[PDB]
Design a protein around this ligand. Structure first.
Ligand SMILES: N=C(N)c1ccc(CNC(=O)[C@H](CCC(N)=O)NC(=O)[C@@H](Cc2c[nH]c3ccccc23)NS(=O)(=O)CC(=O)O)cc1
Ligand SMILES: *[C@@H]1O[C@H](CO)[C@@H](O)[C@H](O)[C@H]1O
Ligand SMILES: *[C@@H]1O[C@@H](C)[C@@H](O)[C@@H](O)[C@@H]1O
Ligand SMILES: [Ca+2]
Ligand SMILES: [Ca+2]
Ligand SMILES: [Ca+2]
Ligand SMILES: [Ca+2]
Ligand SMILES: [Ca+2]
Ligand SMILES: [Ca+2]
Ligand SMILES: [Ca+2]
Ligand SMILES: [Ca+2]
Ligand SMILES: [Ca+2]
Lengths: 191, 142, 254
């Protein structure tokens, strides 16, 4: 038997799955996850796949730093994964423009408050529920010439030249971040 | 899409890409600028990965850029919510929920046992002292 | 114990103090009214096998009280595979001449079943190590029983996280590391034989024995403890055996 390698975290909006190599040949796996000073918890018991969903464990405290390790079976052989701090490195999903209303010479662009895998009480928390003030949205709008706006909520209030059509695209951002600071641009919407 | 002579009409995102499937070229005639056309095209032509309905057991699929995310019901987990949380009653999993000893069984659910000086309670998982000074207990704190 | 605290009187009731000729020798763990688990190396230079004393309910070595019970060691059982002066198979099972009395200050630590210890207890992060050993590397011993919470490491991690040195003993399958590599907390020589106890769902279990290490709380090194789970059957079989002439007994292992 050989130890797993290239353990990688695949996380978006807290949906967190640990992936690894190689394709098991007469070899099964069991994953363990824990926090620095917490007990080791076993997951994906004797699985033959090379992935393990750890979402339910990390959403218990997205601010903690988790370490996982993959055991290989035909102490057992294993490999540690890199440390993972959900809050600081989970990818922001592609946003979606919810709507945009025009009053006179100003347009209100609203960004959909997307839900995350973080569960609290009996529902899923939204991206703003989790990040609060750490999250901002950036608007990339053009006439028919590049223009940009930024908001600390989910709404954009911009000026527009009457009798002219504008297209929009938004992006989620967490300024304080170092890695994965921005999501991908949302689909383009034109008025 | 292109019907006979419609291309005589100026470009229209609604008529061409919303009410119909528009190609890259058609989209480019609407947006004109390459940068803007590509920004539109990456999402428009990405396709909905949730179409294959991958999320099992009553989960909800959320389409993403060249992928998807599954939101599972409480008793489920896994990339596609394929993991039954209620089907992991084995010893290596949190000691099978047993307070002390756990035994796996072939043909019968796991059973819980206790160390000498303790006996298993009616719940089938807890152990209670059967002596005044059972091992592993600190009397002045009990 | 380096970087620990005083174990409040009565909160480390399975701790044993072993004396030879009335002098402090090592620590130990009571697991029965008659049996004590300690370390084999504690008996490397014993000449007077009839002068071994085990004291239970001890706390402050400078004050005597009614909770302390003393017993002569009737037998010291060591694995036939242990070699004096070395580190492997560092375990000893001692039979007391007469059973101690279980009280609020004297209680045995549970000897767990092997699989429970290997699949469950081995993954509980922290465990307590205690003794009247050195308070500092090459320092003086403690008058009051000290205790310390230390995290366990799988051997692969221990080796990877430790400073490789010349004639360093190997960390075998009969051992496990626990502690810190920043030079702040660890057990020490005088704590040898003492308990490495793990708390799990309301009950404490014997998982390790203070065995060896490079100095005490040395930067780049962890304490090494005898992996008790490997000796459960060995211990159970011997406790069900009849006494044998002569204090010292070498029992085969496995
Ligand atoms: N930190 C701990 N938790 C810890 C440390 C020590 C003890 C007591 N055990 C010993 O001293 C044993 C006795 C062996 C015997 N049967 O007589 N020897 C040791 O540990 C020796 C092994 C050892 C020999 N050659 C080596 C070359 C490189 C590195 C190590 C060694 N290391 S040492 O000499 O540094 C112990 C000191 O003096 O403090 C208990 C807990
Ligand atoms: C459902 O469709 C998605 C599209 O990406 C695919 O990944 C799944 O394997 C399929 O079940
Ligand atoms: C989508 O989310 C999942 C978890 C379930 O609550 C579904 O009923 C809902 O439509
Ligand atoms: Ca058309
Ligand atoms: Ca057309
Ligand atoms: Ca056209
Ligand atoms: Ca229309
Ligand atoms: Ca049409
Ligand atoms: Ca054209
Ligand atoms: Ca055309
Ligand atoms: Ca898509
Ligand atoms: Ca005393």
């Amino acid at each position: 038997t050989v130890a797993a390698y290239n353990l990688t975290w695949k996380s978006t909006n807290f949906k967190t799955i640990l992936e690894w190599e190689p394709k098991p040949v007469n070899q099964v796996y069991t994953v363990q996850i824990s926090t620095k000073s917490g007990d080791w918890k076993s997951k994906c018991f004797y699985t033959t796949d090379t992935e393990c969903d750890l979402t339910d464990e990390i959403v218990k405290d997205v601010k903690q730093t988790y370490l996982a390790r993959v055991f290989s079976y035909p102490e057992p052989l294993y490999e540690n994964s890199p440390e993972f701090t959900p809050y600081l490195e989970t990818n922001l999903g592609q946003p979606t423009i919810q709507s945009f209303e025009q009053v006179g010479t100003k347009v209100n662009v609203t960004v959909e408050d997307e839900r995350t895998l973080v569960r609290r009480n009996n529902t899923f928390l939204s991206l703003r529920d989790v990040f609060g003030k750490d999250l901002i949205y950036t608007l990339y709008y053009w006439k028919s010439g590049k223009k940009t706006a930024k908001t600390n909520t989910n709404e954009f209030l911009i000026d527009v030249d009457k009798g002219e059509n504008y297209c929009f695209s938004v992006q989620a951002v967490i300024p304080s971040r170092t890695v994965n600071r921005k999501s991908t641009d949302s689909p383009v919407e034109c008025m | 899409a292109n019907a006979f002579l419609e291309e005589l009409r100026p470009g229209s995102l609604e008529r061409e890409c919303k009410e119909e499937q528009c190609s890259f070229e058609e989209a480019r005639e609407i947006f004109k600028d390459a940068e803007r056309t590509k920004l539109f095209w990456i999402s428009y032509s990405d396709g909905d990965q949730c179409a294959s309905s991958p999320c099992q057991n009553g989960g909800s699929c959320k389409d993403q850029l060249q992928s998807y995310i599954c939101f599972c019901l409480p008793a489920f987990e896994g990339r596609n919510c394929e993991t039954h949380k209620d089907d992991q009653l084995i010893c290596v999993n949190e000691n099978g929920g047993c307070e002390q000893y756990c035994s796996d069984h072939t043909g019968t659910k796991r059973s819980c046992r206790c160390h000498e000086g303790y006996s298993l309670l009616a719940d089938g998982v807890s152990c209670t002292p059967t002596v005044e000074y059972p091992c592993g207990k600190i009397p002045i704190l009990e | 114990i380096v970087g620990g605290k005083v174990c409040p009187k009565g909160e480390c009731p399975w701790q044993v103090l072993l004396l030879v000729n009335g002098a402090q020798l090592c620590g130990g763990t009571l697991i029965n009214t008659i049996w004590v688990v300690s370390a084999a190396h504690c008996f490397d230079k014993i000449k007077n096998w009839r002068n071994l004393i085990a004291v239970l309910g001890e706390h402050d070595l400078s004050e005597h009280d009614g909770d302390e019970q003393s017993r002569r060691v009737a037998q010291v059982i060591i694995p036939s595979t242990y070699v004096p002066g070395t580190t492997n198979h560092d375990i000893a099972l001692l039979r007391l001449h007469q059973p101690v009395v279980l009280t609020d200050h004297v209680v045995p630590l549970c000897l767990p079943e092997r699989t429970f210890s290997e699949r469950t207890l081995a993954f509980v992060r922290f465990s307590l190590v205690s003794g009247w050993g050195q308070l500092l590397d090459r320092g003086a011993t403690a008058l009051e029983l000290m205790v310390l919470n230390v995290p366990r490491l799988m051997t692969q991690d221990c080796l990877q996280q430790s400073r490789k040195v010349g004639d360093s003993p190997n960390i075998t399958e009969y051992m496990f590391c626990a502690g810190y590599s920043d030079g702040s907390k660890d057990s020490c020589k005088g704590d040898s034989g003492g308990p490495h106890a793990t708390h799990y769902r309301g009950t404490w279990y014997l998982t390790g024995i203070v065995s060896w290490g490079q100095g005490c709380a040395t930067v780049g090194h962890f304490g090494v403890y005898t992996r008790v789970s490997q000796y459960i059957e060995w211990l159970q079989k011997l406790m069900r055996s009849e006494p044998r002439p002569g204090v010292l007994l070498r029992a085969p292992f496995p």
